[PDB]
């Protein structure tokens, strides 16, 4: 119900919360951990 | 960082490691706190000394027992830095000062994790039934103003403290409690007071508040629902002060046994901080 | 030799094989800090390597038993075999060369690293027990 | 389970390093900088504490994290020692006449102390081991001592007239007194301006980091003659200007913090001390 | 193959090759730096000469040893044009000049790489624990102003140097250190000073600062955490200056052996630099 | 056993023998400095001992990978057998005790001596490959 440009900027605020939490960053990490281990190659974080 | 995250595998070896009072007689210190009136009534220049020889009987080596003089429940409540391993504090029922006494008991008998508060720059809130604001000093006068989720007053103007709600008028020790989960602009008289944000917890394995007089019903909780009665909360029937001390001496071990000073030490009295 | 023992086992009787430097100890290389603190500047405990037919174990006390009763620190290392060994010819020597040099080791919780800078003394009151 | 010391933490070499460690201290811990007045006076800015704070964000410490405490002398600073923050790094300006004042103050911060109160009036005391010392401090601390033989009689003194006592401290602000172990002594402190307490030493401090400005140093902080301990929480900087000192302290905050950390009593660990 | 590409394989032939000092006696030069007061106390017109004959004993051919006179730690700390293969500098303990001495030691005892800085047009920043600003001259007075990520002051107005932070008031040699990774508008007195941006590299396989007097120090670490004590940092107990020199001569090889070949200058280089 | 194999070979067929602690590695004790300078005060490289049936190899980095990518220094040791070994039972252990103590070593050119003062850390990302 209700929502005065609420659920709207809200469905957007619900967003403006997402990109700033668990699921967010984490996914943002794996992503890099690939780039940074594919681009890297030569000096690719040993890990193992 | 040795501690837990392991399990102590019980097993009922059932071996009994006799006595326990023989280690405390040798290795611990006993600090007796009393009010001035107590000593004044005794009227001897050697009472501390006489009692000390009497303390050898109960098993405490000469240099073991110390005698600290608070002259009031209000000052003792501010300066309570507990000096010895075992502290047994004598309190004389003063009926007008009951809450002063309650607030002081709540501090010694317990444990208290506190951080400094800057009343000037920030809007604070207590979190759980264990987050309380313990303030103490010359004259502690605390006025409060609850904030709605906008930083706006509720029954007050965050701008004029004449609209605040007074919850303490010049006390020497105060444990303030506000509706949990609500921000408040605070107005303490920081000139004579210090207010700190404390988290509670571990009862005290030392102080044994021994109460002289009345008929006592001690309600030391902030809520209405609970009433805790601990062993470190004893009571003696008033006759004369010399008698009180004789009893304290005649039953030192019994009183000490109701504490047990292993969790003690700490490194100074009261507060804490972990700022 | 092998079939010889294969039979004797069918008839349910006393078997037995012969081994040079047997492989009875699963690889295990670790330590146990009996006294430690965050800075790891005054530790006491043991570290070892059990592997194959060999055991090396060292007991260390950063304080050199300064506050220990009789200025002596006791150590102990127990190894439980998964199978009984009989007729064993064993070499026992003092000192654990493997744990006689400077090391930087991971803490028990893996959160940091400690420094081990050994100086070796002869093991006192050595007692080896082979139990069954 | 609280104190029952589990006899071991495993010793298996899993070998997994839990990376960083500075990223937990940046988030969760407080840094308290102690300096002398002269230090700040030479800086002459109303916003130096502020400027340095923004500079501290660089090294990774959130705005409300760092605090600046002003001792105006080594004597005062060594008289009420109430270390306020998680990590304390204290700056000391080399004053050659105050060396022992400084030594006694270092001995207190750099170490972990346990004390009890002493009643000089009623009970003549004695120290037990190389770790039992008498730490007294206040306005003006003047301590005279009188060794007792096994009869409660003086040895080179009359337990009756303090004019025969042996003076071992004349008006200091911090004093760690040491007497021949295992001997009783009638003590005569000036309790009016002094407080003397019986302390047992030990645990060191996983915090301070006394950073010394000037001289040449080597620091002998033991009461004996035999030992000389040099710890990581005892650093030294070459004096140029005070602004430079602070820049360096900031430019190497983590390095300085890494040389400290934890503090036995500042964790869950207490069911102890 | 010059390209400072490297490989070498350490088979233990164990041919322990003999002497080492008999190549240095023949092929190298020794330069002794002392303060004026040192020579004045000696009061001879032939001291440089007498010591030279004495130097033949220790094995240094006549034309081999040179004697350079700095009259102060501040001037000596200036152009630093170490003249010979081996330089052993004598420093007399002046307690007020300690940092002057520290800054000078830090320069000789170490290998420096510098570039020029234009304080006028570009506000700079240091990068690592090895990027320092070494300025030196008549009178070096450096005031600094830290910039936030906008080119705006932090506790200062990039416009009025009266709000800057003074970090050096008229020194003859100064190694300035600022919070790493922060831009700064600099205000040096370029008239009498020169400030250059240096990156610390190798150490020096030459100098051998020999310290007279005190009980001693001179720490060359800018941080608080480290304290490095090298072989090229020796100390002698003061009696008289003639004695100091006698000892320096009586132990020339011992002192030289604690230094040796100035590796950054060795012919055999290339991509590494000279 | 021996004649048994003498025949099988004379007929041009697949031979084979048995050895406890075979002697496949010619004695070789040396080092390789991957980073060095005249003073030998900041070296990086490896040193080893190949002899008989054993190999010990240590990788050292005086700088403790302070300026290395990911603060990790890679090492590698390759040993080429003169004959193929099959069916090998091998013990692999971390650490090279032989190179865990202070040494004064001759320089590669034999002109001087360098100082090695090791402190041991666990080898990271150990990978052993047996190639054919
Ligand atoms: Zn064998």
UniProtKB/Swiss-Prot annotation, chain B:
Disulfide bonds join 31-84, 114-198, 140-193, 145-156. N-glycosylated. The N-terminus is blocked possibly by pyroglutamic acid. Glycans are attached at residue 18. Ca(2+) 2 binds at residues 126, 177-178, 180, 250. Residues 114-116 are annotated as: CNP motif. Residues 186-188 are annotated as: LVD motif. It is found in: Virion; Host endoplasmic reticulum lumen. Ca(2+) 1 binds at residues 44, 155, 163, 165. One of its GO terms (molecular function) is metal ion binding. The keyword Calcium applies. It comes from the Viruses. Keywords: Calcium, Capsid protein, Disulfide bond, Glycoprotein, Host endoplasmic reticulum, Host-virus interaction, Metal-binding, Outer capsid protein, Signal, T=13 icosahedral capsid protein, Virion. Residues 202-204 are annotated as: GPR motif. One of its GO terms (biological process) is receptor-mediated virion attachment to host cell. GO terms for cellular component: host cell endoplasmic reticulum lumen; T=13 icosahedral viral capsid; viral outer capsid. The keyword Glycoprotein applies. Calcium-binding protein that interacts with rotavirus cell receptors once the initial attachment by VP4 has been achieved. Rotavirus attachment and entry into the host cell probably involves multiple sequential contacts between the outer capsid proteins VP4 and VP7, and the cell receptors. Following entry into the host cell, low intracellular or intravesicular Ca(2+) concentration probably causes the calcium-stabilized VP7 trimers to dissociate from the virion. This step is probably necessary for the membrane-disrupting entry step and the release of VP4, which is locked onto the virion by VP7. Some rotavirus strains are neuraminidase-sensitive and require sialic acid to attach to the cell surface. Some rotavirus strains are integrin-dependent. Some rotavirus strains depend on ganglioside for their entry into the host cell. Hsp70 also seems to be involved in the entry of some strains. Belongs to the rotavirus VP7 family. This is Outer capsid glycoprotein VP7. It comes from Rotavirus A (strain RVA/Monkey/United States/RRV/1975/G3P5B[3]). The lineage of its organism: Viruses, Riboviria, Orthornavirae, Duplornaviricota, Resentoviricetes.
Swiss-Prot record, chains C, F:
The N-terminus is blocked. Zn(2+) binds at residue 20. It comes from the Viruses. It is found in: Virion. Coiled coil: none annotated. The VP6 trimer contains a zinc ion located at the center of the molecule. The zinc ion is not essential for either trimerization or transcription activity of the DLP. Zinc-depleted VP6 has an increased sensitivity to proteases. Intermediate capsid protein that self assembles to form an icosahedral capsid with a T=13 symmetry, which consists of 230 trimers of VP6, with channels at each of its five-fold vertices. This capsid constitutes the middle concentric layer of the viral mature particle. The innermost VP2 capsid and the intermediate VP6 capsid remain intact following cell entry to protect the dsRNA from degradation and to prevent unfavorable antiviral responses in the host cell during all the replication cycle of the virus. Belongs to the rotavirus VP6 family. Homotrimer. Interacts with the inner capsid protein VP2. Interacts with the outer capsid glycoprotein VP7. Interacts with the outer capsid protein VP5*. This is Intermediate capsid protein VP6. The chain holds residues 134 to 265 of 397 of the full protein.
UniProtKB/Swiss-Prot annotation, chain E:
N-glycosylated. The N-terminus is blocked possibly by pyroglutamic acid. GO terms for molecular function: metal ion binding. Residues 186-188 are annotated as: LVD motif. Homotrimer; disulfide-linked. 2 Ca(2+) ions bound at each subunit interface in the trimer hold the trimer together. Interacts with the intermediate capsid protein VP6. Interacts with the outer capsid protein VP5*. Interacts with host integrin heterodimer ITGAV/ITGB3. This is Outer capsid glycoprotein VP7. It comes from the Viruses. Disulfide bonds join 31-84, 114-198, 140-193, 145-156. Calcium-binding protein that interacts with rotavirus cell receptors once the initial attachment by VP4 has been achieved. Rotavirus attachment and entry into the host cell probably involves multiple sequential contacts between the outer capsid proteins VP4 and VP7, and the cell receptors. Following entry into the host cell, low intracellular or intravesicular Ca(2+) concentration probably causes the calcium-stabilized VP7 trimers to dissociate from the virion. This step is probably necessary for the membrane-disrupting entry step and the release of VP4, which is locked onto the virion by VP7. It comes from Rotavirus A (strain RVA/Monkey/United States/RRV/1975/G3P5B[3]) (RV-A). One of its GO terms (biological process) is receptor-mediated virion attachment to host cell. Ca(2+) 1 binds at residues 44, 155, 163, 165. GO terms for cellular component: host cell endoplasmic reticulum lumen; T=13 icosahedral viral capsid; viral outer capsid. Some rotavirus strains are neuraminidase-sensitive and require sialic acid to attach to the cell surface. Some rotavirus strains are integrin-dependent. Some rotavirus strains depend on ganglioside for their entry into the host cell. Hsp70 also seems to be involved in the entry of some strains. In group A rotaviruses, VP7 defines the G serotype. Belongs to the rotavirus VP7 family. Residues 114-116 are annotated as: CNP motif. Ca(2+) 2 binds at residues 126, 177-178, 180, 250.
């Amino acid at each position: 119900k209700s929502t005065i440009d609420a659920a709207k900027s809200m469905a957007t605020s619900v967003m403006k919360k997402f990109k700033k939490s668990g699921l967010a960053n984490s996914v943002s990490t794996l992503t890099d951990s690939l780039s940074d281990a594919a681009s890297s190659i030569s000096r690719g974080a040993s890990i193992r | 960082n040795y501690g837990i995250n392991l399990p102590i595998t019980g097993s009922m070896d059932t071996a009994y490691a006799n006595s326990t009072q023989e280690e405390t007689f040798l290795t611990s210190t006993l600090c007796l706190y009393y009010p001035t009136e107590a000593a004044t009534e005794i009227n001897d220049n050697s009472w501390k000394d006489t009692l000390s020889q009497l303390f050898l009987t109960k098993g405490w080596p000469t240099g073991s027992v110390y005698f600290k003089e608070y002259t009031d429940i209000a000052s003792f409540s501010v300066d309570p830095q507990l000096y010895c391993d075992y502290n047994v504090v004598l309190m004389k029922y003063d009926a007008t000062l009951q809450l002063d006494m309650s607030e002081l008991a709540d501090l010694i008998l317990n444990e208290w994790l506190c951080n400094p508060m800057d009343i000037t720059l920030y809007y604070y809130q207590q979190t759980d039934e264990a987050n309380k604001w313990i303030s103490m000093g010359s004259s502690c006068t605390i006025k409060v103003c609850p904030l709605n989720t906008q930083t706006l007053g509720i029954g007050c103007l965050t701008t004029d403290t004449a609209t605040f709600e007074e919850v303490a008028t010049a006390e020497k020790l105060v444990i303030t409690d506000v509706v949990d989960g609500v921000n408040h602009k605070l107005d303490v008289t920081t000139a004579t007071c210090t207010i700190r944000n404390c988290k509670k917890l571990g009862p005290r394995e030392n102080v044994a508040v021994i109460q002289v007089g009345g008929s006592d019903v001690l309600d030391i909780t902030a809520d209405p629902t609970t009433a805790p009665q601990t062993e470190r909360m004893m009571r003696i029937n008033w006759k004369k002060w010399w008698q009180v001390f004789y009893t304290v001496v005649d039953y030192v071990n019994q009183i000490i046994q109701a504490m047990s000073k292993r969790s003690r030490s700490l490194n100074s009295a009261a507060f804490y901080y972990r700022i | 030799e092998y079939i010889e023992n294969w039979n004797l086992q069918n008839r349910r009787q006393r078997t037995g094989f012969t081994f040079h430097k047997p492989n009875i100890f699963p690889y295990s290389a670790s330590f146990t800090l009996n006294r430690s603190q965050p800075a790891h500047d005054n530790l006491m405990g043991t570290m070892w390597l059990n592997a194959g037919s060999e055991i090396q174990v060292a007991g260390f006390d950063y304080s050199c038993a300064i506050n220990a009763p009789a200025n002596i620190q006791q150590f102990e290392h127990i190894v439980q075999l998964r199978r009984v060994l009989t007729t064993a010819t064993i070499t026992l020597l003092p000192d654990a060369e493997r744990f006689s040099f400077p090391r930087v080791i991971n803490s028990a919780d893996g959160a940091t690293t400690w420094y081990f800078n050994p100086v070796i003394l002869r093991p006192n009151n050595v007692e080896v027990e082979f139990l069954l």
